[PDB]
Design goal:
alpha+beta; Dodecin subunit-like; four-stranded mixed sheet; globular; structural genomics, unknown function
């Protein structure tokens, strides 16, 4: 999973699966490597291949990275419902 | 070189290394994968590890991808002025 700007998003046409928020109390995130690693983990959890951090804010000791998860246009009905 | 968000640049404090423009008449750039290696190339040439697309503008057949190069303070004055 990689992140792109609105320029790429609206040009290559990406679909949003959901919005992720990485809230880490203190030095749980040290470098951008940590940040992107958790971003991709959560983005991939949504099923998306792309993401974009809309709000990377510093809530005191707690770091909150809010990003939107974008998927490639290859998704359709997940017929499950229930048994 | 990776593309980071403007908030990341401002949160980690990245030094502005310069500007890189990919102005192609098509063919050279079709996928973001093409553009990435170009941007990373030009950024690496200037000596940056990060970049951000600030304007991916499509003017007819001429696609202009304007990104700016950012890197941490790992530069030094050179005693290689000329001789």
């Amino acid at each position: 999973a990689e992140q792109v700007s609105k320029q790429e998003i609206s040009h290559f046409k990406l679909v949003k699966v959901g919005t992720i928020n990485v809230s880490q109390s203190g030095g749980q995130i040290s470098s951008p490597s940590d940040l992107r690693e958790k971003l991709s983990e959560l983005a991939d959890a949504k099923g998306g291949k792309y993401y974009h951090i809309i709000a990377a804010r510093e809530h005191g000791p707690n770091f909150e990275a809010v990003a939107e998860v974008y998927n490639d246009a290859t998704k359709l009905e997940h017929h499950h419902h229930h048994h």
